[PDB]
Amino acid sequence: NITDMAGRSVVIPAKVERILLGEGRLFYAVSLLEGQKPFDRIVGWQGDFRKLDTQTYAVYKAKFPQVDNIPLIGNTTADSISPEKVLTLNPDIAIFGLSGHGPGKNSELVKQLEKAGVPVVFVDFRTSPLKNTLPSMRVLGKVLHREQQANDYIKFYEDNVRKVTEITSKIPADKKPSVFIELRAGAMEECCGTAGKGNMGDFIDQAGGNNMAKNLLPGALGTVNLEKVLSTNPDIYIASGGKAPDNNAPGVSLGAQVTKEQAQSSLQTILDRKGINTLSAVKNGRSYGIWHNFYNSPYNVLAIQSFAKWFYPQQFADLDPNNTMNSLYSQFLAIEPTGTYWVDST
Amino acid sequence: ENITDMAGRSVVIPAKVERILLGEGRLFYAVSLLEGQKPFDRIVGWQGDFRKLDTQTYAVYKAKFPQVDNIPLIGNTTADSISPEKVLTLNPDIAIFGLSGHGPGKNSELVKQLEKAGVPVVFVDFRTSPLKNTLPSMRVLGKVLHREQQANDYIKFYEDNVRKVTEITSKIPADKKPSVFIELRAGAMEECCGTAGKGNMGDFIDQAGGNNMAKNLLPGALGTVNLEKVLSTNPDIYIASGGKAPDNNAPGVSLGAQVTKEQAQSSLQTILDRKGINTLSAVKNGRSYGIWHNFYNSPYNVLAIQSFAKWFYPQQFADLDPNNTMNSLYSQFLAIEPTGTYWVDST
Amino acid sequence: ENITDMAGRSVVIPAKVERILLGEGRLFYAVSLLEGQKPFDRIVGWQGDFRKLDTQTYAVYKAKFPQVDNIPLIGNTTADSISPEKVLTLNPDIAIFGLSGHGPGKNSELVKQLEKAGVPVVFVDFRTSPLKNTLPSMRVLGKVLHREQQANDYIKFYEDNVRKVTEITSKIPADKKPSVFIELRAGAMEECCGTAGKGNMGDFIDQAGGNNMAKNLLPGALGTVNLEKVLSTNPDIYIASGGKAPDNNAPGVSLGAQVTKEQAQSSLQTILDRKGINTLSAVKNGRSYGIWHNFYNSPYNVLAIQSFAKWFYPQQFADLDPNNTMNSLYSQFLAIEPTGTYWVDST
Ligand SMILES: N=C(N)NCCC[C@H](NC(=O)c1cccc(O)c1O)C(=O)N[C@@H](CO)C(=O)O
Ligand SMILES: N=C(N)NCCC[C@H](NC(=O)c1cccc(O)c1O)C(=O)N[C@@H](CO)C(=O)O
Ligand SMILES: N=C(N)NCCC[C@H](NC(=O)c1cccc(O)c1O)C(=O)N[C@@H](CO)C(=O)O
Ligand SMILES: N=C(N)NCCC[C@H](NC(=O)c1cccc(O)c1O)C(=O)N[C@@H](CO)C(=O)O
Numbered sequence A: 001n002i003t004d005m006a007g008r009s010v011v012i013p014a015k016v017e018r019i020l021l022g023e024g025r026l027f028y029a030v031s032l033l034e035g036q037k038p039f040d041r042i043v044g045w046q047g048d049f050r051k052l053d054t055q056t057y058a059v060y061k062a063k064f065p066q067v068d069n070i071p072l073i074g075n076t077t078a079d080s081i082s083p084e085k086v087l088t089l090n091p092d093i094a095i096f097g098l099s100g101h102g103p104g105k106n107s108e109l110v111k112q113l114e115k116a117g118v119p120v121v122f123v124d125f126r127t128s129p130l131k132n133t134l135p136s137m138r139v140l141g142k143v144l145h146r147e148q149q150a151n152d153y154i155k156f157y158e159d160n161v162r163k164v165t166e167i168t169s170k171i172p173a174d175k176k177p178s179v180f181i182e183l184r185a186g187a188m189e190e191c192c193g194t195a196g197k198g199n200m201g202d203f204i205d206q207a208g209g210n211n212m213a214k215n216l217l218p219g220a221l222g223t224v225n226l227e228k229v230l231s232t233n234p235d236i237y238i239a240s241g242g243k244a245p246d247n248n249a250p251g252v253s254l255g256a257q258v259t260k261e262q263a264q265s266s267l268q269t270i271l272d273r274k275g276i277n278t279l280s281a282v283k284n285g286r287s288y289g290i291w292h293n294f295y296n297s298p299y300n301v302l303a304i305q306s307f308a309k310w311f312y313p314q315q316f317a318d319l320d321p322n323n324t325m326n327s328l329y330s331q332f333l334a335i336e337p338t339g340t341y342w343v344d345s346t
Numbered sequence B, C: 001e002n003i004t005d006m007a008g009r010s011v012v013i014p015a016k017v018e019r020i021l022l023g024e025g026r027l028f029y030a031v032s033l034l035e036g037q038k039p040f041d042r043i044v045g046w047q048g049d050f051r052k053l054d055t056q057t058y059a060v061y062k063a064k065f066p067q068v069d070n071i072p073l074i075g076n077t078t079a080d081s082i083s084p085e086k087v088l089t090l091n092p093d094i095a096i097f098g099l100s101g102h103g104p105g106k107n108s109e110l111v112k113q114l115e116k117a118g119v120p121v122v123f124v125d126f127r128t129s130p131l132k133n134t135l136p137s138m139r140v141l142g143k144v145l146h147r148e149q150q151a152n153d154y155i156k157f158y159e160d161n162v163r164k165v166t167e168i169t170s171k172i173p174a175d176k177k178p179s180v181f182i183e184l185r186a187g188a189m190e191e192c193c194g195t196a197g198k199g200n201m202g203d204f205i206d207q208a209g210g211n212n213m214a215k216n217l218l219p220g221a222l223g224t225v226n227l228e229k230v231l232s233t234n235p236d237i238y239i240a241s242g243g244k245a246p247d248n249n250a251p252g253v254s255l256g257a258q259v260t261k262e263q264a265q266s267s268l269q270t271i272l273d274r275k276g277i278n279t280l281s282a283v284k285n286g287r288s289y290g291i292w293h294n295f296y297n298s299p300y301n302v303l304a305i306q307s308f309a310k311w312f313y314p315q316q317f318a319d320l321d322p323n324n325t326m327n328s329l330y331s332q333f334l335a336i337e338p339t340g341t342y343w344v345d346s347t
């Protein structure tokens, strides 16, 4: 038996072959365990990975066209999941997130699955990445019978994060740069989405930054008004996005099918917005883009490294997130790394 | 032919023993010193604490003895989870229990049931009063299990290896002794900070010539002291106990048979990086250490008394090496090979 | 409604409060700023520290309110002496506790008992982290006791009176600051010398633009530094805290509601005449002072921050008078008349 991220006891199945993904992008944690056979044990998933990660999807489709035939249990919201379609896939395990675009610990679907005799595991990369990322992988390892892959990934992760924390854990608060992260910048109805005590805030903390929204918000995600950002006038501005290159909607283009030219061109649009464009950080060129889906992925060590190099350029001159990304893919994944997951303003 | 156990009770020695019941699984450690190359041959069943709270030492014995998985578990990790029915159907001819711990005590119903069933019960203790009880416990186990030679051999080994410490620390006056705080299962409890009073690992601090800051804060062998009380006392030496497996992302110190030094140093450091702890003088000065938790209930505890002495007086015990003591212990008495890290220093 | 206390815990605000339990008696000081001319009307019971460790302020309130003697004492001066049974039979509708001090903390059993009984518990702090916690504590007490107006009035008063200091001392560079040692309950402890680190009266030294010599000697808010370490550091300014009653022949500094300037100066001098202390440069040069100890846990601590700034930079704060601040505090908020000596200079 194991304790999941909701504190609940889960009896590990003897053999797993029918994994249900409550949130599609929980695939990222699964991908680190399944080696060259990524989709072999997925009976169905939330449609967020296919619809909100179109780039990473297309790359896996070109090498694995059977991905199109994995059933979508819903669209991009917990409320759109048919519990009936879920149960007819006869899962032998269901992986859910404490938060996100899929069911949480108190949903009806979780109770239905408990009545059906199906083990449910809660992980978390989104609410409390710092507390939860590694424990989540340890647990997924045990319940999916991929302890070796999991232990390998934890060692890789700890080592690559320790490269940052060995330095930033000793830096005193008054020497840290102030940071604002604008999630899905440009692309929300009301500006400005950001992270508080949690989510990408954990990355700012680890990378030795000072999140200006840490004390403005009670939860992991929330909203701060444009004028509050202008008034705080933080040292460093970071925008997250995952927009596909050939999408004329507002947002930052980043992901597997994005070139540096397009990442720079679209970040600039984001930085040219009224108000934003007068920020000291934007004028001084301390303005950056990070791929949004790192907000819910155990690949988040790539962002902690990208934030650290932006917060202390020379102290992390020698650190290369692209090499960490390449080591990750070659050691663990079944596709080749492409595209741009981070960008600096021209 | 009768013996007095650690509960003051007389126990008549069985003519032949072949079905030993272990009230606490980790009481196996005392048994292992007697059974030579046939460690599990006489164990009918045991509490699940050894298998579930000592996964590393378990796995090593499993690789050499896969039949260990088939020894029945009479419960999980608490006295209240033991089914007395499963116990009695194993038809034990002796039951070994601890005065304290994760198994039944002298006043439990199960002890009375066993007395009604005609089964001798022996109380040992390595946990409440290690200094008073460890050697008497082994003497007794020797007599009731018909391994007097092994027991007497282990007592001589133990006394000699402890005397290496006490010859020096017994002459040191109180005012030249270091203040010490031991945080049991540091990082891994709900509320900080577990420790030992007059008993348990406190006995080891006493013997090794240290001054346990919790000796007078607590009435019993185990208890709790608040973080702020530790900060305020600001002791010269900080020690954290743990037994966490390397592959366990829960909080705590990794130590045991399957732990490397790098793993032990990295995980001790996490423990020392916690708010409050990290401002301790002992932590800043590098007088910060890790000890394997299960020494809190094992006659192998001479290893800890030695590690403490070398931490309490580094140069006066430069020449003492607990690893040589462990290697001699294993080769003389056990059926497995010593591996892993049972003690670590901070870098 | 709901609020966040000083332990990070959410507390549901009672609709009406009429039975306040004080975990530490001297938490009364925070309550007194809210209750106007009816100070004791809503107190069901309190720790005995206010009555036994603040005999002077007690006696003054007794002369105007003799019913104070009938408020139940839930214990003496230590968390361990509180009967949880007597507490629960008072049927409190709220309990106010301190993160630290002579009453229960966030992890005590009594706090859990009260949670089981359906009684809201609020943690405040004037003692561990006065700078971070004093004003947030008052805002919170305001909300849960339905005295938001009084609380907001006191915060404005406090901020303004502290700003009179910080406007000046916040711009002073470290190398122009005087070194300071504060000896808590000077002369009156078994082992010299109690003091404050990064917290407690240390926060006041920081705000008043001083350099606390124990800031980096200690991990916690309170601790101990040896006499010789003080002598060696030989700080610019020496401060002794006390609250001893005039007619008490025990050692310590006399300060409080019933102490005259001459009793405060005479008793400070005894404290400064002690072996070792009397060779300090600060003592010989007359930069030696007394501060009333209970400011170590009171939202009236703005009086200590102001007394400190005036000792640290006499001419820059020539025009500042902490006595006017106390009188403005008493007249605006309290139900008694200010008397006695809360601070003293050596002649
Ligand atoms: N399209 C919707 N109606 N909901 C979206 C899903 C869940 C929601 N998402 C976010 O708040 C969010 C914020 C910033 C950036 C993102 O990518 C986001 O997905 C959400 O998290 N809701 C909370 C509270 O209900 C939760 O599920 O815990
Ligand atoms: N809690 C909400 N109602 N909205 C916040 C999240 C929902 C929605 N998110 C996306 O469209 C999205 C796209 C790519 C990756 C993601 O994680 C996403 O969450 C959203 O942000 N909607 C905007 C309007 O488009 C909004 O509601 O502000
Ligand atoms: N999981 C539980 N509910 N109880 C655990 C077992 C019994 C308990 N153990 C400890 O207190 C303990 C403390 C520090 C370190 C350890 O390894 C521990 O096992 C226990 O000792 N109970 C006391 C009193 O009930 C006793 O048996 O004497
Ligand atoms: N007496 C108690 N109620 N708790 C303390 C002991 C119980 C538990 N112990 C262990 O997990 C354990 C592990 C390895 C070796 C041991 O000897 C153990 O006791 C424990 O400490 N639980 C924590 C919370 O999980 C706690 O009590 O706070």
Ligand SMILES: N=C(N)NCCC[C@H](NC(=O)c1cccc(O)c1O)C(=O)N[C@@H](CO)C(=O)O
Pocket (backbone or CB within 6 Å): B226, B228, B229, B232, C077, C078, C079, C099, C100, C101, C102, C105, C184, C185, C194, C195, C222, C293, C296
């Ligand atoms: N009478 C006792 N045995 N203990 C008193 C408990 C409060 C204790 N007080 C001090 O340490 C103290 C030091 C200097 C000056 C003072 O006026 C003091 O009251 C205390 O603070 N305990 C801390 C740490 O244990 C706490 O409760 O967190």
Ligand SMILES: N=C(N)NCCC[C@H](NC(=O)c1cccc(O)c1O)C(=O)N[C@@H](CO)C(=O)O
Pocket (backbone or CB within 6 Å): C053, C185, C188, C189, C190, C191, C243, C293
């Ligand atoms: N926690 C401890 N063991 N000692 C520190 C404080 C205990 C005691 N305090 C007081 O008597 C006192 C008086 C007025 C106001 C306070 O806040 C007080 O704490 C104390 O100082 N004890 C002395 C012995 O006299 C000591 O322990 O050195």
Ligand SMILES: [Fe+3]
Pocket (backbone or CB within 6 Å): A101
């Ligand atoms: Fe989202």
Ligand SMILES: [Fe+3]
Pocket (backbone or CB within 6 Å): B102
């Ligand atoms: Fe235990």
